[PDB]
Every structure is written in structure tokens, then in C-alpha cells.
Amino acid sequence: ASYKVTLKTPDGDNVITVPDDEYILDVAEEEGLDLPYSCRAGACSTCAGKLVSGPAPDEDQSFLDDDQIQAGYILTCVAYPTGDCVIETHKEEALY
């Protein structure tokens, strides 16, 4: 219902709180932050995150995007937080 997620972005460690029915960037943006994205669809790599800590955000959404959620690589434009969490957020320079 409202997991405290921390994003370790360029500039600092900001901590948002996102409801479980809200994509992590939907929130992130409303707060007034960036993460780079394209498609808004999980169609690509641009808004790629890395889970530091936490569960795993239900990413049963954004997929055709190379089967490595597992690496901790999560796609922020189509992510549902499942609990409390920390995530690195500028992350295509891993994926390639």
C-alpha cells in the first residue's frame, strides 16, 4: 500500500513512498524527479533501475525486455514496488 522506496540518483538519495498500484517513476516524476525514459512501456532500456535492497517490484508488465529482472534489473516505467526498497536509477550502462 505505500512502500518507502529510496532511489540513489545522480544527485543524492531521495526517498519517495509509492502506493503498490503506482509505477515507481509515476511517483518519482510527481515528486519532481527524473529518471530517463522513452516508451513509457517497458519496451526498452532507458528507464532501467537496479534493485539495491528490497523485494522486487512486480515487473510482470514491462517485458519483451531481455529476461534479467533477476540481476536485480528492474524497469521503472512499469514497476510496482512490493515493499520497502533501494534502487540505483540511471541504469543502461549495464544492460547495454
Among 16, 74, 75, 85, binds ligand FES (CB under 6 A): 75
Which spans in the chain are helix H?
24-31
Among 3, 23, 37, 73, binds ligand FES (CB under 6 A): 37
> Which element (helix H / strand E) includes 86?
strand 85-88
Using the rule CB under 6 A, is 62 a contact of ligand FES?
A: yes
Could you tell me which residues come within 8 angstroms of residue 67 by beta carbon, excluding any fewer than 6 positions away? none
Using the rule CB under 6 A, is 38 a contact of ligand FES?
A: yes
Cβ 77 to ligand FES shortest distance, Å:
3
Among 33, 43, 86, 95, binds ligand FES (CB under 6 A): 43
Q: With contact defined as beta carbons under 8 Å apart, do 95 and 70 qualify?
A: no
